[PDB]
Amino acid sequence: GAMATAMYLEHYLDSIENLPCELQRNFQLMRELDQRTEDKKAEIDILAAEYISTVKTLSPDQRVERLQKIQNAYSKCKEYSDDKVQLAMQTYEMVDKHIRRLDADLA
Template identity: 35%
Template sequence: MQGQGTYLENYLESISTAPTELNRSLALIKELDYRSGEVVDKIETLKANLLATTPSGRKAAQELLNEKSSKSLKNDIKMILEYADEKVELSNQSYELIDRYIRKLDTELKKFETEIEEAEDDKKKKKSSITADTPKKGKSSSTLSRKKSQAEIVIPDPKMASSSELDMAIDPNEPTYCICGRVSFGEMIECESSGCKIEWFHFECVGLTQPPKGKWYCPDCTKKRSLK
């Protein structure tokens, strides 16, 4: 990604010739204005003489009416129109020059804004990735999902229900736990060992009547820990 200063430097370098080009066009327009003014003054003088009532005015009128003067007047008018067309063309060129540099500036600004947005998106993605890789305290997502699944389907305690009631209540898709291989019901406890294959156990299956104090490990994990 280019820095803001680099974008500005590149743009200023690209328009470095613009003032010279504009000054040239304006100088030419000014020169054409001057030439047009001279021709207009000449025509105005002839017009004033034509309308004058003095002898000199009548003489000028007679000269204007002859073929040579008439042709000269037509050429002067044609020249003024040509000067006007050249000035319009130079004005259009100057406008297009300025417009081109404005469009270039808009393009460069758009590119700069796009790169800033992409950089911000990359930062957010990296931050999200770091957050996702950081272990969270407490229960794992699989444990929370399991608890949610257990809450959706209420399984009666086997001690309080008949076998037919249990068969009707058990969802065939319900996951099984414990050393007994049955679904979740009643009070259950989680093994604190991170490598436990079963994880959750029914109180009655592991000989518990109430939650133990401190960390609790299932029989298999307790044996493994004692062998270390």
Template identity: 35%
Template sequence: MSATDDVDRSSWLSGYSDTVEALPIELQRNFTLIRQLDDSAQELMDDVASKSLCLMNQKTVLSPKERQQRLANIGSLLNEVLKRGEEKFALAKSTYDTVDRHCTKLDMDLQKYEDEQLIGPTMGRPSTGTSTAGSDKRPEKEEHKRKKRKQTRGRKKGIAPEVDEGQQQGEYLSAEDAKQHAQSAISLSNLPIDPNEPLYCYCQQVSFGEMVACDNDECEIEWFHLECVGLRTPPKGKWYCKNCAELLKIKQKK
């Protein structure tokens, strides 16, 4: 590695560090504004509820003009609530885009750094058995990262540890809860999603809420949202998705 490369990397790290350090301040500002808008919208809604109740319980007969004025005032308050909601959405989207932009840049730079680490040592050298072995390490590294990610996500999402004996199920969802989750999944699909974000589960959505991992190492989907598989709580033992469970039954019959 040349001195120029060291200087470039040092310069990049310094610049990126400054950007990342400023990120929490920007996010905190956005979250504070969102909270203020939310409080303001709630005050307006309380005012709407109060005036609507007053209008409905009005004992004296109002003239059509006065009644129209009160309704117009309530409508104006509701329009203000709608504006607060639109501002909150714009701030939330801006916050998402900011974080997504930083994550994408970091992913690209890390990939570039890994590529340099793999390619750099072999530059200008003849092809040997050692260099070939080095090139074969990448898939092993990716597989290790996949396993590590699986273990990490299990801890983060509260997945129960494996149990050697038996397959214990968690508490199942009611039909009403499952219906509500389906509606939530539909709403989630309308949100902007990072194209690089991996998709999971039967619903093919990003990771959210509590998730459970299929204990079949060869499972194509691997991770599932609890609600999508009809569970309310994580299973306390080994758990297999319906696809892998069917495959295991077929193998056992053979």
């Protein structure tokens, strides 16, 4: 999990350049994936606000068109959030499988 991952990163301070590539990639991917999510959450807040401020003057066709953008964003945001959970699992399993070799078996 997260404690083990922290202890793992904190142990590789001695050779951060020699930290596994598979992990360097998964940590960089989660950072990116979180930025995409927060950007979608923000887009959703803006789109929602904009809908609320103008809904009286929007015709049925143009309300639906605005609702597509928010739906599409709201689903892509859920898609990222779900992808983050599955990636965070794999990474914690990758770390626990690493520790079992490094520290439990002792190489």
